[PDB]
Write a protein that binds this ligand. Structure first.
Ligand SMILES: Cc1c(Nc2nc(N)c3c(C#N)c(N4CCC[C@H]4C)n(C)c3n2)cnn1[C@H]1CCOC1
Ligand SMILES: [Cl-]
Ligand SMILES: [Cl-]
Length: 261
């Protein structure tokens, strides 16, 4: 009801909808509410949200529908978004980046383990609690890629062009997991350089060709230390069948380097 909740401010807009800081008119509890203005899509999103139980995935509370409006209730992330911790053209301190990347991989390992692909991993969708623990949010593009132990290939184009893997632009069908791995490597680049390497990973994009030709003396690569750059060389591999998998990311030298807060 317009009587149970006060909409105090917009937190942003997701793939399919928009998000308000709602305050309870009775208890003053502050939550995030996603306000859906119109379906088969939200039925699917609510179903996936009900599956989620992990420290690095957003807490779902429940949902209400009123006419052509539906309301999804989630834990308000008191630390805001990772996007807001990235200093343009700088990034953030390498130890903070490494901890966030550890937590990102734990959330993604959890999702992939229950056969869910997120499909829109980017800093706008990665939230922080009051202890700066990272939470993977926005399940509006999420879908099942594994059921009864059988993999299904993806065939729909979606996500955010600077974060999408190249196969998603080129192939009629592709594996879900390597796409999410790619977008995590663009997130790591953003965290360490405070800039995105390209508009899209297409041959008609010069910044993408430059990377394929290994010109890491150019930005954003020249801002990144050799160890995390070496991980980014294994993640941002054009052929998804040669791209590093999460088990191997967990064996990376930089991933395992002790770093000082
Ligand atoms: C408390 C707070 C948040 N907290 C928050 N908590 C959520 N739970 C979501 C959320 C979801 N779910 C979401 N969005 C936007 C569209 C995609 C989705 C991830 N956004 C953006 C969410 N932001 C964001 N800033 N601040 C502070 C700092 C500046 O302002 C107040
Ligand atoms: Cl910016
Ligand atoms: Cl950025």
């Amino acid at each position: 009801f317009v009587e149970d909740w006060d909409l105090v401010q917009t937190l942003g807009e997701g793939a399919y909808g928009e998000v308000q800081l709602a305050v309870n008119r009775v208890t003053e509890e502050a939550v995030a509410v996603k306000i859906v203005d119109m379906p088969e899509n939200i039925k699917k999103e609510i179903c996936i949200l009900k599956m989620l139980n992990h420290e690095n995935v957003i807490k779902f509370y429940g949902h209400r529908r009123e006419g052509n409006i539906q309301y999804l209730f989630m834990e308000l992330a008191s630390g805001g978004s990772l996007f807001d911790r990235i200093e343009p053209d700088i990034g953030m301190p390498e130890p903070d980046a490494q901890r966030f990347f550890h937590q990102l991989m734990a959330g993604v390992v959890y999702l992939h383990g229950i056969g869910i692909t997120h499909r829109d991993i980017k800093p706008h969708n990665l939230l922080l609690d009051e202890r700066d623990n990272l939470k993977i949010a926005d399940y509006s593009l999420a879908t099942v890629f594994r059921y009864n132990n059988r993999e299904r290939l993806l065939n729909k184009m979606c996500g955010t062009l600077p974060y999408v893997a190249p196969e998603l632009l080129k192939r009629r069908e592709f594996h879900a997991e390597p796409v999410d791995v790619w977008s995590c490597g663009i997130v790591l680049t953003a965290m360490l350089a405070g800039e995105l390497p390209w508009d899209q990973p297409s041959d008609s994009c010069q910044e993408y060709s430059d990377w394929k030709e290994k010109k890491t003396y150019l930005n954003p690569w020249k801002k990144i230390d050799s160890a995390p750059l070496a991980l980014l060389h294994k993640i941002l591999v054009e052929n998804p069948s040669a791209r590093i998998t999460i088990p191997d990311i967990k064996k990376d030298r930089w991933y395992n380097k002790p770093l000082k807060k």
